[PDB]
Structure 1
Amino acid sequence: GAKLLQILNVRVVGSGERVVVLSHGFGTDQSAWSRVLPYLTRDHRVVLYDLVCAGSVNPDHFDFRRYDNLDAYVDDLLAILDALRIPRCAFVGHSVSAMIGILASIRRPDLFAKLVLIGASPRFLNDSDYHGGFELEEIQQVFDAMGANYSAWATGYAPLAVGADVPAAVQEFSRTLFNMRPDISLHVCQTVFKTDLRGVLGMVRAPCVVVQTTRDVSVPASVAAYLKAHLGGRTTVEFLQTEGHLPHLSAPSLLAQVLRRALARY
């Protein structure tokens, strides 16, 4: 309840009758939302928190057996909302949090009025007649890299993830990426890559906006199309006119426009 609010560094800011949850992705924490936040705070009550795997959350609270699937992250999210006494909200989440949001909307359809998914994929691994963008050997090489020299891995990965040449964004992402516990980073990455949400997408009742950039290193353009086609609710794909996996860091003013539009009516 209240302790969880402290453990996950929960914050509520802004004024408006409508509630939005901003849920960060891998390698970041809630500070990643800082640039888009001012566009929202006039019209919304905004909840921010850190995922348990965030570097800004004490690694002692991370349970390796518990967090071995995304449903545990969903537990934390639902427990946060119930603690804050929020009966209904819109959920915006990035990367792994998009996955968490999908699962939470299935668990508690009454709680989630709308989903906005950024850099979202149901499955990263390739399959028969499914292009996720990665092959088993490719991902294996990553795990080895994260395992052998983590900082070296992080140094190489951060600019690929940002993907546009935006030195300040690369730096901000590196701050929170390097500060992650290397073993927790690997674990989350292993959990995510073993996740296949394709089968449950049809169970989502909430209207969804899939936000897609021109180039995402972990998310092929065809995946956004797949989500729109297979999500059970009314779904639209919004395209950003710029590239990268972290548009809230790399082009926050552009992402804010799509968000303001997506959160207009839910």
Structure 2
Amino acid sequence: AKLLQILNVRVVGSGERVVVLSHGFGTDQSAWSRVLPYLTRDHRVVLYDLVCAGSVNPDHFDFRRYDNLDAYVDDLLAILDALRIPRCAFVGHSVSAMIGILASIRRPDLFAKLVLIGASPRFLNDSDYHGGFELEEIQQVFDAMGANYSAWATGYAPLAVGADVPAAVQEFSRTLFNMRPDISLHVCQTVFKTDLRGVLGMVRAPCVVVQTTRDVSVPASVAAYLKAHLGGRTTVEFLQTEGHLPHLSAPSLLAQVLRRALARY
């Protein structure tokens, strides 16, 4: 209820097929603006900002509550409950792909389908597991985020976008710079702490894992790992371009994959 307002919840479009757009680290719901008109004809679209988004009042951020991704799942569920939507497809980027996986396990009745973009179950390497990151690597990043947040944000943006698409760099920079630096580091620590490998078989929803040709946070082998471990019917749909933010850098191509993934659920 207060959440509806606090997280800037908007419902646009129309249809018996409800879809939730749940954005990732460093953006807010506006990151979906380019793909949104491809879904508005056929679906009722629910959009919201994560409590850590720069567009949400940062004094809402309770540092103890959001120690864990469960608390973000709480909000998502409270949002859906407030709207009396008893079933939906969910599209999650980055940290929201993790949020959607947890939410779909807590409420399988609610999530008829997942679509996972820039998704990983764990970023740290492990004996037989290639996450893409070692402990020293992340720690260097946490240390830069505190030392000089704006320099870190300026160096991270182009790498997240991956392809040379200056409009996407600038737009990802604007939301990145809009995050309160202490919140931003907090979320980044939470995410890099998270390990969903064990609960992947608990997801019952069909799922589409969207793979780009390169992702600074998601090595090539992670998608085939998700496909082999998610417990519902899972496919990996491929974009012919690179980057961690395709909804900013290749929105037309992403819109193709979204229309197809959201056809039947």
Please give the TM-score of this superposition, normalised by the length of structure 1: 0.99
Secondary structure of 2:45's counterpart equals strand
Residues 92-124 of structure 1, C-alpha deviations (whole Å, 9 max, x = no match): 000000000000000000000000000000000
* Equivalent residue, structure 2, for 1:207: 206
Q: How big is the shift at 1:17?
A: 1.5
Alignment length (residue pairs)? 265
For 2:220 and 2:43, locate their aligned partners in 1 and report how far apart those are by CA, in whole Å. 30
- Structure-2 separation of matches of 1:71 and 1:241: 34
The CA deviation string for residues 58-82 of structure 1, in whole angstroms up to 9 with x for no partner, is: 0110000000000000000000000
Counterpart Cα distance in 2 of 1:114 and 1:18: 11
Aligned counterparts of 1:155 and 1:60: Cα–Cα separation in 2: 25
Counterpart for residue 159 of structure 1: 158
Deviation at 1:152, TM superposition (A): 0.2
Residue 50 of structure 1 and its aligned partner are, at CA, apart by 0.1
CA–CA separation in structure 1 for the residues paired with 2:258 and 2:30: 17
SS of structure 1 residue aligned to 2:2:
helix
Q: Residue 179 of structure 1: CA displacement?
A: 0.7
Instruction: Write out per-residue CA displacement over residues 193-220 of structure 1, whole angstroms, 9 at most, x where no aligned residue.
Output: 0100000000000000000100000000
CA offset at residue 16 of structure 1?
A: 1.5
Task: Give SS of 1:91's match.
Answer: strand
Name the CA distance, whole Å, in 2 between partners of 1:189 and 1:225: 24
Aligned mates of 1:153, 1:60 — CA distance in 2 = 23
Q: Which runs of 5+ in 2 are unaligned?
A: none
Cα deviations by residue, 1:220-251 (Å, 9 ceiling, x for unpaired):
01000100000000000001000000000000
Instruction: Report the counterpart of residue 42 of structure 1 in structure 2.
Output: 41
Shift of 1:3: 1.1
- TM-score, normalised with respect to structure 2: 1.00
Residue 120 of structure 1: aligned partner:
119
Unaligned runs of 5+ residues in structure 1 are: none
Per-residue CA deviations over 1:132-184 (Å, capped at 9, x if unaligned) read 00000000100000010000000000000000100000001001000100000
For residues 28 and 21 of structure 1, the distance between their equivalents in structure 2, rounded to whole angstroms, comes to: 16
Query: What is the CA–CA distance in structure 1 between the aligned matches of 2:59 and 2:149, rounded to whole Å?
Result: 20
Residues 3-30 of structure 1 show CA distances to partners (whole Å, capped at 9, x for unaligned) of 1100000000012211000000000000
| 2:11 alignment counterpart | 12
CA distance in 2, matches of 1:15, 1:137: 47
3-state secondary structure, aligned to 1:12: strand
State the identity as a percent.
100
Q: Distance in 2 between matches of 1:20 and 1:175?
A: 26
Give a deviation string over 1:20-65, Cα, whole Å, max 9, x none.
0000000000000000000000000000000000000001100000
Aligned pairs for 1:1-266 (under 5 A) are: 2-266=1-265
Determine the C-alpha separation between the residues in 2 that align with 1:48 and 1:250: 20
Q: Which runs of 4+ in 1 moved over 6 A?
A: none
CA distance in 1, matches of 2:15, 2:256: 18
Tell me the CA shift for residue 186 of structure 1: 0.2
